[PDB]
Design a protein around this ligand. Structure first.
Ligand SMILES: [Cl-]
Ligand SMILES: [Cl-]
Ligand SMILES: [Cl-]
Ligand SMILES: [Cl-]
Ligand code: NA
Length: 129
């Protein structure tokens, strides 16, 4: 599924992401835009052999099982394919574990490089939430 901007904002809010660990909703929407262009089916292979999955490009080295990332963990206890679903529940719940891990949203390199320190509220402006 490719979400619209405000559609995704609403879905994120509904699953308890606005201000989760103190990150306002626009942060999550911005990160999703740059990670996946709002596409739940997005995948990206890393040089280390891990893969990033889904709307928030959650990596198999730590968070999910894909069967093909040697030495990895599955701390969200999900198959990585769960992260590709048109329903974002699994991505949201895993993202809450990641952002709680100590480095906040810096876990998402694209958030650090393209959203951090910007007017992230722009991403939810206009939206009926
Ligand atoms: Cl915001
Ligand atoms: Cl497996
Ligand atoms: Cl594996
Ligand atoms: Cl933080
Ligand atoms: Na894994």
């Amino acid at each position: 599924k490719v979400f619209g901007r405000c559609e995704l904002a609403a879905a994120m809010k509904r699953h308890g992401l606005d201000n989760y660990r103190g990150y306002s909703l626009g942060n999550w929407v911005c990160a999703a835009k740059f990670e996946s262009n709002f596409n739940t089916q997005a995948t990206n292979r890393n040089t280390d052999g891990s893969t990033d999955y889904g709307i928030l490009q959650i990596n198999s080295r730590w968070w999910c099982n894909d069967g093909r990332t040697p030495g990895s963990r599955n701390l969200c206890n999900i198959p990585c394919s769960a992260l590709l679903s048109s329903d974002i529940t699994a991505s949201v719940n895993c993202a809450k574990k990641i952002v709680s891990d100590g480095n906040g949203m810096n876990a998402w390199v694209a958030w650090r490089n393209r959203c951090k320190g910007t007017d992230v509220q722009a991403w939810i402006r206009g939206c009926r939430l």
